[PDB]
Structure 1
Amino acid sequence: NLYFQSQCTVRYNVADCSHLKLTHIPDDLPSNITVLNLTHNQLRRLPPTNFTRYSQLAILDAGFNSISKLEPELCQILPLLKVLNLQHNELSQISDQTFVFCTNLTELDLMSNSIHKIKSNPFKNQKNLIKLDLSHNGLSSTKLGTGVQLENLQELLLAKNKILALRSEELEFLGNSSLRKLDLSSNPLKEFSPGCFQTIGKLFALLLNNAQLNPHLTEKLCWELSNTSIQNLSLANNQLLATSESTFSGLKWTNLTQLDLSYNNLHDVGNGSFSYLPSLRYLSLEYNNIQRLSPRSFYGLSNLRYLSLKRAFTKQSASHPNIDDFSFQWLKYLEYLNMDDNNIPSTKSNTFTGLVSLKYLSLSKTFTSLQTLTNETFVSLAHSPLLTLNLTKNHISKIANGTFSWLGQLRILDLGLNEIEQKLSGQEWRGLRNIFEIYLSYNKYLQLSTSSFALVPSLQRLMLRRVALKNVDISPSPFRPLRNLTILDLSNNNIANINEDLLEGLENLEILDFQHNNLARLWKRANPGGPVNFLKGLSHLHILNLESNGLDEIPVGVFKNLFELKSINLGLNNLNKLEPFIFDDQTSLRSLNLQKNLITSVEKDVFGPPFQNLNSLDMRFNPFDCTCESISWFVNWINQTHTNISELSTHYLCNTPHHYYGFPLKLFDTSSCK
C-alpha cells in the first residue's frame, strides 16, 4: 500500500515527509515546527539557506538519503538544534569547521557514513554532546582528538569498524567524561596496550560482541580492565571455547555486576573459574555447549541473584548433558534460574540443594526422559521458597500422588503443552496449601472427579483449554469447593453435557470462557429437561464468552440478575430467534459481540437495554432483513449513537430482500415507515 500522495502529511510541529522521493527541501511548512522526519528520500545535499524559513527546528532527522556534505552555516541558521541524524548517508570527510556552530547539540548520529579518517579537534564546541554515534563507518583508530574533550559525553558507540587495538594515548581525550556505555562490538581487536581503559574518566558498561576474542586475548583484556568502575560487560559472539581460574583473574579488582557470555560455544567451565566475582549479580550463559557441571563450577559466586541457562548445555546427538548433584550449593542468594531448551535426562536427588533463596524457576522444554513426576523428583527443592514453576513442553505423561508435597509455598504452576493423560484423583496437589494458579491447557485428556480440586481451596485461576475433558457432569460439581476461583477457561474441550449444579457456589468468579464446546442442545425450548441455568448466581461475572457452541435459542432467565457483565461474546452461533427481554438486566454492558450468526431482524424489545450504554458493538456477517419493520430502530440508533462500530460501512449487508442484496445497512432509508 502507499497513498503517500504529493505533499507530506504535516502534523503538530512534527513534519514527517518520509518516502516521497524528494530532491529539494520543502519550505511552505510553518515556522513553528521542531521536527523534520526527512527519512527515506533521495536528497543530495542540505543547502544551509533553504532552512532560513524556520529557525525554530529542534531535532533534524535526515537519515536514509544521499547527503555528501554538510555546511557549518546550517548550525548557526538552526540555533535550537538538539538532535541530528544522518544514518545510511554518504558523508566522507569531517573538517575541523563543520560542527563549530552547533552547541545546543546533545545527540549526534553518523552511523552508516564513510568517514574513513578524522584528524582534527572537530568536537571542540560540543560541550552538550551526550550520545555520539560512529558505528559502522569504516574507522581504524578510536582517536577523535588530542585534548580532553566531550566533557559531558555519556554514550559512545563505535561498532562495526576496523579498530585493531586500543592504544593508551589515543583514548586520553576522555579525561573527565563519565562514559556509561562504550560500544565496541564487531571490531577485530588484536591488542590491548597497558592502561587502555584506566585512561577514561569513568567506565560503566562495555560491549565487545562479535569481537573474535580468545581465552588469551580476553585474559590480557581482563588484566587491563582491573581497578576501574565497570559494572556491565558483554562477550557475546566469540571464540571463548573454554575458561579457567586465570581467565577472569583480573576482574577481582572490579565491582562487576553483569556478565554476558552467550553465543561462545563455551564448552567446559573450569573449576573455580568464577572465584573472583564476589559481586556478580546478573550472569548469562545462553546458547553455548557446556558439557558438564561440577560442584566447583560455580564456586565463589556467593552473591549472584540471577542466572540464565537457556540452551546452555550440549545438544542431544549419544552425548547427553549432565549436571551432577550439589551443583548449586554456592549460589546461596540466587533467586531466578531460567533453564529452558536443554536435554538434562531428569532431576537427581540433590540437584538444587542449597538454593535457599530460589523464587522463580523455569524448566520449559529442558527435559527429554522425565515422563513421570514421582514424589522424589522434587525432593531437592524442599528448601526453596519457590513462587513459580514453568514446566511446559516436557512430554510429561503422568504424575504420582503427592509429587508436589514439597513445594508448600508455590503460587503459579505451569503444566501446559504436555501429554498428561490420567484421572485427577485429587492427590496430585497434595501439600500446595498456598497454590494460586494452575495451568493445564493443551494436554491429552483428564478425567475429573468429585474430589479432584478439593485439596486446593485457595486456588484463584484455572486454565483447561484444549484438554478434551470428560466426566464433567458429576454431582457435586468438582468446582464447587473452589470458593476463591475467578477465571475458569473450561474452553475448547467439547462438553456434551453440563449438569446445572456446576458453578454453584463460585460466587467470586469473574471470567468464564466456554467456547468451542458444542453445548447447543442444552439451550432448548423443547427441553428434555428444563432449560439449563448453570449461570445461576455468579453475580461477579464481568466477561462471559460462549462463542462457537452452535447456540440457537437462549432461554429466558439465564442473564437474570448478572448486573456487572461487561462483555458478552456470542459469536459464531446459529441465533436467529431472539426472545423478548433477554437482556433486561444488562445495563452496564460495554461490549457486545454477535458476529457470524443467523440474525435477520434487530428489534427494540431485545436490544434496547444493552444498547443504552454500549461502547463497542460487533454484529457483522448477518443476514439482516432490510425492511423498516426489522431494522428501522437499529438504523436510527446507528445514525444517532456514538458507539464504536468497526467496519460499519462494508460488513453489514442485507441478504434480503434482493432489491437490497448488498445494500449497506447504514444507507437504509427509514423516513417513510410509521
Structure 2
Amino acid sequence: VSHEVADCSHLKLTQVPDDLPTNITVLNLTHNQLRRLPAANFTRYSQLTSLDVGFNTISKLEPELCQKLPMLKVLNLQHNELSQLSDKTFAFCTNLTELHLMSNSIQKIKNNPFVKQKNLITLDLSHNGLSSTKLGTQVQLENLQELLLSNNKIQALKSEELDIFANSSLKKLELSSNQIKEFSPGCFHAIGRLFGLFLNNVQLGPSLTEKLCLELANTSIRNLSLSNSQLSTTSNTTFLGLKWTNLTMLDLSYNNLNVVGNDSFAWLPQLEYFFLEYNNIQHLFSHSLHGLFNVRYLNLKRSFTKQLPKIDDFSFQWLKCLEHLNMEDNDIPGIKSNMFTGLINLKYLSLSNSFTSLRTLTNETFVSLAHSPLHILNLTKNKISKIESDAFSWLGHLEVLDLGLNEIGQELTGQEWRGLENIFEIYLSYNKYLQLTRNSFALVPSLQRLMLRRVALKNVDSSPSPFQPLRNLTILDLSNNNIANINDDMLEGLEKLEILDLQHNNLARLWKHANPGGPIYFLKGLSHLHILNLESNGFDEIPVEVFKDLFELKIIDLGLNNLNTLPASVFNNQVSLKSLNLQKNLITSVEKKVFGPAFRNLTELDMRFNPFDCTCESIAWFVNWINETHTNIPELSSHYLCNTPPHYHGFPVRLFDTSSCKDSAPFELFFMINTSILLIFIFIVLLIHFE
C-alpha cells in the first residue's frame, strides 16, 4: 500500500492524510474529494518530489504550498477546477520539472505566471479553454521542451505570443484538435528551435496546408503530424517550403487522400518516415511518390478505397532506401509485372488482406522483387487457393514467408518452394487442404519452423518421412488436422526439434495394444524436445517405453483425453519436467509408481475436472504432496472434487485427511511383534511344562 508511494486512488479521501510515514516521496490522490491544499498541513512533508492531486475538485491552489517542498519535480493538476491563474502561484519555487494542468477551464493568461521555473521541461495546458497561445510577456522557460496546447480554442497563431520561446527548444508542440485558420507571417520563427509539430484533428484544407508548409521556412522541424486533417487533394506546390527544412517524419493519415498529384513530395529529399494509413486514394498516379529516395518506412494500411483502386507500373521506382513497406488491409486488384520494381533496399513487405481476388500464384507474380533482398513476406487473408511452380524463385534472401489464413487447396508437389535457399519460417496454417508428397519439403533443407494448424492434412502416411530433408527443423505444428495414420518412421534425424504440437487429432487408436502391428512409436529420436501438446484426441492407453529419448522435456499436455489408468515407469526419463496438464480426464488414482519422478521438480500442475476416488489407498500420497510443496495448482478449492464414494461426492480433495489409512499408524509392526512374542512365549512355556 505504501512502498515509496502513496496509493490513495479509488479510496475517497476528502483531506490530505497526516499519518503516512515521513519517508515518502511520491503521492497519488487521484479519484478523491480533495478540495483545498493548505500549506500548514504539509509542514511534516518536505522531501517530496512527485505530487498528484488529479481527478479532484480544487478551486484555487494555495500559493505558499511549494515553499516547503524544495524537491518537488512532478506536479499534476489533472481534471481540476482552476480557471484563473495568478503570478504568485509559483514564484519562490523553481525546482519544478513537470507541470500537468489538463482539464482546468483556464480562460486566459494575464502576466507571465510561468516565469520562475528555470527547470521546467514538460508543460501541459491541454483540455483547457485558452483562446490564445500567449503564456508570458518576456523571455522565459529556457529549458522547456514539450508544450502541449491541444484541445483548446486557439484561432490563429502570431509571433507576438510565441516570441517568449526565443531561447528554448520545443521538442514537441502539441497543437492538435484546434481551429487554426490563420498563420501570421513569421509566427513559427519566434521559437529558437522547433522540432516536433502536432496538428491533429484540425480543419486545414489545401489552402491552409500550403500556407502552413510555406510558413515553415528556414525551420529545423523534424516531425510533422497532420493526421485527421481532412486533406483531400495535394499538388506539387503544397509542400513547397519543405525543401528549406530537414524534415524526417511526416504523418498524413485519416485525411481521406482522394487524389495525389505528381511530384507532391518532390520537396522532401531527407524524409525518412512517411505515414499514409487510412485514406481514400482512388488512383495512385505514376509520378506520385517522386523525390522520396530516403524514406525507410512507408505505411499504406487502409490507404486505398474499399470495394477499386488503380495502381500503375513503376509506382515505387524512386523509393530507393525503402526498408519497410506495409500495404495490408487494401483492395489492390492484382500484382502487375512491374509493380514493386526499384526496391533495392527492401527487407519487409506485408500484404495481409491487400488484394480483392488473388487466386492463382504463377511464376510471374513476384518478378518485381528479383532485385530486392526481402526477408519477411506476409501474405494472409488474400484468398489464395492455388500456387503454381516457381512462384517464389525470385526471392532468394526470403527468410520468413507466410501464407496462412487463406483457402489454399492443392497437392504440395515440392516445386513451389524452388528458389528459397535462405528460407527459415513458413506459415501455412488455417487453409483448405494440403496433400503431402515424398519430395514436398525436399527443396527447403534450411527450414527451422513449420506451422500447419487447421489444414486437415492428408497424404502424410507415406513410406518415407515427408519431413526427412528438414534436418534443421525446430518447431513443428500438425494440430487440428484430424490425422489418424502416423508411422514410426516420421521424426528421425530431427534431434533439434524443440516444439511439437499435435492437438485436436485422432491419435487414439495408434497407441493402443489391440491394433495390428502394435503401438506406434513416433516420439523416438527427438532428443531436444521441449514443448509437447496432445490435447483433445481421446487417448485411452499410453505405452511404457514411449517417453525414452525425451530427456529435456519441459512442458507437456495430455489433457482433454480419456485416460483412466497410467502404466508404471513412464516418466523416468523426464529429468527436466516443468509442467503437467492432465485436465478433463478420467484419472482416479494418483500413485507413487506412476507419478513418481513426474512430481519431483514440477512447477505448474493442472488436473482440473478429474474424478478422483476419495480413498486413502489411492490418493494418500497425492494429498500429502498437495499439503506441502512448491508447485502451484490454480483453482484447486472449487474444481478438484470426488465422485466416489457417494458419501464423499462433491467434496474437495484439500479437505481429505490422510491420518486414517493403512500407513497412518504402524499397526503392522505391532502385529509382527505381538505375534512373535506370543509364539515365543507359548513355545517356551510348553518347553518348561514338558521339561
TM-score by length of 1: 0.96
Structure 2 letter corresponding to 1:22: L
Q: Which residues of 2 match residues 36-115 of structure 1 at below 5 A?
A: 36-115=27-106
Task: State the shift of 1:48 in Å.
Answer: 2.4
Partner of 2:679: none
Identify the structure with the greater helix proportion: 2
**TM-superposition CA deviations, 1:385-420 (whole Å, max 9, x none):** 111111100111101111111111111111001111
| Distance in 2 separating the partners of 1:154 and 1:644 | 49
Deviation at 1:580, TM superposition (A): 0.8
Partner of 1:235: 226
1:533 to 506, 521, 524: 521
Q: Does 1:213 align with 2:204?
A: yes
Return the offset for 1:201: 1.1
User: Does structure 2 retain, via aligned residues, the 8 Å contact 1:416–1:442?
Assistant: yes
Structure 2 distance, partners of 1:110, 1:308, is: 34
Q: Describe how 1:337-376 pairs up with structure 2 within 5 A.
A: 337-376=325-364
**Equivalent residue, structure 2, for 1:625:** 613
In the TM superposition, what are the counterparts of 1:434-445 in structure 2 within 5 Å?
434-445=422-433
- Which aligned pairs between 1:244-263 and structure 2 lie closer than 5 A? 244-263=235-254
Question: Equivalent residue of 2:325, what SS?
Answer: strand
State how far apart, in whole Å, the 2-side matches of 1:507 and 1:123 are: 68
| Aligned-partner Cα distance in 2 for 1:267–1:442 | 35
Matched-pair contact (CA < 8 Å) for 1:500–1:534: yes
Take 2:95 and 2:559, find their aligned partners in 1: how far apart are those partners? 58
| 1:212 counterpart letter in structure 2 | Q
Match of 2:115 among 120, 124, 127: 124
Structure 2 segments unaligned to the other structure (5+ residues): 664-691
Structure 1 position 77, deviation (Å): 2.6
- Whether 1:561 aligns to 2:582 is no
Q: Deviations over 1:431-489 (max 9, x none)?
A: 11111110000001111111111111111100000101111111102111110101111
Aligned residue identity for 1:428: E
**Within 1, Cα distance between the matches of 2:643 and 2:58?**
58
Q: Which residue of structure 1 aligns with residue 594 of structure 2?
A: 606
Amino acid at match of 1:142: T
How far apart are residue 79 of structure 1 and its match?
2.5
Quote the residue 1:300 is aligned against: 291
* Alpha-carbon distance in 2 for matches of 1:538, 1:33: 56
Distance in 2 of aligned mates of 1:401 and 1:669: 68
Q: State the AA in 2 paired with 1:506.
A: L
Specify the code of the residue in structure 2 equivalent to 1:248. F
Structure 2 equivalent of residue 226 of structure 1: 217
Question: Counterpart in 1 of 2:623?
Answer: 635
Q: Which residue matches 2:437? A: 449
8 Å contact kept, 2:15–2:33? no
Equivalent residue for 2:182, pick from 177, 188, 191 = 191
From 470, 473, 481, the counterpart of 1:485: 473
TM-score between the two structures when normalised by the length of structure 2: 0.94
3-state SS, counterpart of residue 30 of structure 2 = coil
Deviates more, 1:640-649 or 1:359-368: 640-649
Secondary structure of 2:88's aligned partner: coil
Query: Alpha-carbon deviation of 1:549?
Result: 1.0
Deviation by residue 1:19-56 (Cα, 9 ceiling, x = unmatched): 12322222221111112211112222222222223223
The one-letter code matched in structure 1 to 2:519 is P
Distance in structure 2 (CA, Å) of the matches to 1:659 and 1:587: 39
Question: Do 1:575 and 1:598's aligned partners in 2 also have CA atoms closer than 8 Å?
Answer: yes
Q: Following TM superposition, by how much is the alpha carbon of 1:11 offset from its aligned partner in structure 2, in angstroms?
A: 2.2
Paired letter, 2:472: N
In structure 1, the residue matched to 2:406 is 418
- C-alpha contact (below 8 Å) 2:277/2:300 kept by paired residues: yes
Deviates more, 1:660-669 or 1:83-92: 660-669
Q: Name which one, 1 or 2, has greater alpha-carbon Rg.
A: 2
Question: Which of 526, 547, 558 does residue 570 from structure 1 map onto?
Answer: 558
Letter in 1 for 2:403: L
Structure 2 counterpart of 1:436, one-letter code: F
Does 1:151 pair with 2:151? no
SS of the equivalent of 2:481 reads coil
Deviations 1:238-274 (A, max 9, x none): 1211111110001111111000100111111111111
Summarize deviations over 1:95-138 as a string: whole Å, max 9, x none: 00111233221111011111111111212221111110101111
Contact kept? 1:30, 1:54, Cα under 8 Å: no
Aligned to 1:504: 492
C-alpha displacement at 1:76, in angstroms?
1.5
Paired with 1:412 and 1:530, the residues of 2 have a C-alpha distance of: 40
What SS does the corresponding residue of 2:619 show, helix, strand or coil?
A: helix
1:664 deviation in Å?
2.3
- Do structure 1's residue 430 and structure 2's residue 421 form an aligned pair? no
Q: 2:675 corresponds to which residue?
A: none
Say whether the 8 Å CA contact 1:295–1:329 is kept in structure 2.
Answer: no
> Cα deviation per residue 1:59-107 (whole Å; 9 max; x = unaligned)?
1111111111110121113332211111111211110011123322111
Instruction: Give the stretch that moved more between structures: 537-546 or 609-618.
Output: 609-618
Q: How many residue pairs get matched?
A: 662
Conserved 8 A contact 2:524-2:549: no
SS of equivalent residue, structure 2 residue 242: helix
Distance 2:480 2:458 in 1: 12
RMSD: 1.2
